[PDB]
Amino acid sequence: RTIVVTTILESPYVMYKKNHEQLEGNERYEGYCVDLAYEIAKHVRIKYKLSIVGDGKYGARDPETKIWNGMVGELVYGRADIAVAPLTITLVREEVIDFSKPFMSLGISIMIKKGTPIESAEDLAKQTEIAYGTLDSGSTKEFFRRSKIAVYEKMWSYMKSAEPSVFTKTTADGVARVRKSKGKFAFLLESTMNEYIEQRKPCDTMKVGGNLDSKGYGVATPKGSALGNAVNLAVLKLNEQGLLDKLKNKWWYDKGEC
Template sequence: MERSLWVAFCLGATLFLLDEPTLADATENGDYTSKDTDSVRGGGKDWPMLYVTTILEDPYVMARGTELEGYCIDLLEKLSEILHFRYKVGVVKDGKYGSLSTNGNWTGMIGEIVRKEADLAVAPLTITSIREDVVDFTQPFLHTGIGILLEKDTILEDASLFHFLAPFSKEMWAGILAAYVISSLCLFLAARVSPREWDGNEDTPFTFLNSLWFGAGSLALQGAVPLPKSLSVRIISAIWWLFSIVLLTAYIAGFSFVLESGSEQLSIQTFEDLVKQRHLEFGTMASSSTLRYFKESKNPIQQMVYESMNKKKDTVLAQNYQEAIQRVLDSNYAFIGETVSQDLAVARHCNLIRSPEVLGPRGFGLATPQGSPWTNKLSVAILKLGEAGDLDQLRSKWWESSCSHDDHDKWSPLKPQALGGIFLILALGLALGMMVALIELSKKSRRTADQEKKSCCSVFNEELSQRFRPREIKKQETAGKSKP
């Protein structure tokens, strides 16, 4: 009797183990492995079962011992909690995302969805028009673009002779030049209008050239002559001094960051820079949406990128991201791919960097068979996760950087918006100075009008015309008065 019970127990245990394959078998053979949701939520056995296909891609889906983990697994878990479904996850058999082969059949995860071998594809699948023709995509759960992944040591070049201009942007330098010229002009006009600076017989010491020199001396924090005597000119001078002090402080602080960050800068900032250089090979993943993007692009630079990759397709096209990243680390190679995956590589390999330019904004979505009732439900659930901040939390969890970032890595040339307040104060000060100069002249005109029994407005106009009369007319009038 005991022997019979023992045989029955062994037979039952064997059947149970055969019924539930291990993750290792699922990973190697492409079979499905189930997630036990019953232990987490009551009533899970009554929920519908979805068969999910995915691909091993760090950090989206990774095999850790006997379990799958990663961004997509966490996302799938959250979606199942919201929509109340169970799921079995299997790794795609051919290890591909999905592309249209020459015989008209789809490969990879897209192929499994088209053939209805799976109900859902949860992976970093780029939403494209050609894929949208054969499957349905949900709302994007991650947004990305096309960037260039590079090794820092291979793209650093010495700073240019004009590296001292780096603390300010081009717009900022243009704004400073305009402020300097306008302030000097206001200084000249106020000195001409103010009675204390112009006596009527001789030109004021504040000629336009002298005003330019006065502004340059103030900007360099050096003493400058002539000294202002009237209130209006002193207001303009004081506001220009304040502007100069703030500007120099900002420049010195910015230049300190430039010096601390070293005398090197990236030689490849854009795809045009990548095409023009000759010491780096560049490529992308074979049969990827990125390669198709450059193939179908009408942009001349992007066409040149595709032609270069197509000529050397046997050597520059990588089969997966791991191979591409390793090539960037080991050789003179630049990888063109999804920025979100490149950001992960930069976070884990401190010697890698992504170029600033990003092309073709796109998104990663979940794929379902056409007409599936789950598509809209999953889209709404993804939107809810985004609104609740869960998607950002997952991104921070799996994209956590192991590299230390110095302050100068976050620095960028100063733009006019950063010092917009001091520009506004300068404009108000110049306007105030000009108004005070006109008030000073109007007071003098009123006194002269009372003495000569004339209209105040006529005297004011005469004073203005006398101050801005050309030198030749003045000389002629002076010569005419000196004749008997």
């Protein structure tokens, strides 16, 4: 059979080729995860077709209906065989799907407009002149919320009662708010995205300080999948071959603009 690989339109992981209107199948797409799926399928010896997730979501369980959305849903309800995407390895997800060992590391990070006098979380917490927020619904907001940790507890208090709202509907909106804030807004988001935006014109943003946590993205397969073991080993092999670092350099820095 041709294996179905669910993925997500997130730059630079999966993006449309310029004339994608004119193209067919896997040829429609390019990016880090396009390259990754290609290399994995080579080592696992499978034919495959990329499938863009229909709701544009990674995967969360609705607190009410208990239905999984996004790519996680595609795996659990049997539409996709594997997810190759920047899907974060988390406890609730690992309970319902299997992940490979991480193909990329990351953590919560601070994005500022260049020139903003901020160099760390501690810098943000003590002051109020510069506003800061996060995505309104993800895992970054949860880190601060479910964080029994000093300075981050102070940050959460501020964010939860801030006026108006410092939580953004999308990651992209957060980024735009930093850019248009004249230095009065900072945004917390995945380090990999922060690093990516720092490489986009007009080069007006910067990542500052260390990461506040540590996580990995993994390739996902359903429980009991015949592919699980061949996918895990392929990811380890690619790391040791230097491919994964080569792909990150390619899409972040060789193709960067700053």
